[model samples]
Target: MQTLSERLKKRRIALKMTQTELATKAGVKQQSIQLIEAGVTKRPRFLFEIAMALNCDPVWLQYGTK
Candidate 1:
């Protein structure tokens, strides 16, 4: 199964958003996105913000479910 970060990274890329752009939209640092996508961070808050910014389902980000 893909990790939350991996799923989020795929969604973000599918949306054609840069890490920097996602960070800006999500109110986080670009480095934060880098770390998350690299599997360094897995906190709920971070994931929540990312999912919300991407207009994705938080549950999907958490568990790969629709």
Candidate 2:
């Protein structure tokens, strides 16, 4: 019912965080945050660190439930 952009935006919004804030906390590139927050996608690199930093659901973060 939601795109990654929407979910990610809601995720950030949930904690009153911006892409830059989340990126700084996640140690990921702010630009990448923008792209993903904008609906661009990826994996195999920052996902682990990213998941740890975001403190959210890893499966929900990366993709649908396994």
Candidate 3:
């Protein structure tokens, strides 16, 4: 996907993780995940945490390639 939101949503789903689950794992609020996936938070502050929770590369999560 071209956008971080799209990549995040796709990856989360691929991992069979719910937004709430990801939020808890990432130590962020569920609304954070919701906003990010909705494209509202285009640049989330918890990018690294979210990527770690998703078991993905932060660079790839944000820019689509490491």
Candidate 4:
């Protein structure tokens, strides 16, 4: 995806994860997940945890690069 918001949201959907569910799994607040997916929170401090929760590379999630 062209943006972190796009990538994170699509990846979460692809993994069949709800925003609330991802927040639980990632140890973050549901609103954080919501904001991130909504593109309001472009850079989240919980990115690494979210990446682990989604089973993705943090680098790719943030920069779309392997």
Candidate 1, 4-58: lDDT as tens digits: 7788788899999999999989999999888878888777577777788889888
Ranking by TM-score: 3, 4, 1, 2
Winning candidate number (TM-score)? 3
**Where is model 2 more than 4 Å wrong at Cα?**
none
- The lDDT values for all models are 0.84, 0.72, 0.91, 0.89
- The local lDDT score (0 to 100) that residue 59 gets in candidate 4 is 88
lDDT of 2 by residue, 24-56 (tens): 888877898788776776552676676676787
Tell me the alpha-carbon RMSD of every candidate.
1.6, 2.2, 1.4, 1.4
Q: By lDDT, who's the top model here? A: 3
Candidate 4 regions with alpha-carbon error over 4 angstroms: none
**TM-scores for the candidates:** 0.85, 0.76, 0.92, 0.91
Worst 10 residues of 2 by lDDT: 42-51
lDDT per residue for candidate 4 within 1-66, as digits (tens), equals 388899988899999998888998999989998888888988899989999999998988988764
Clashes of each: 0, 0, 0, 0
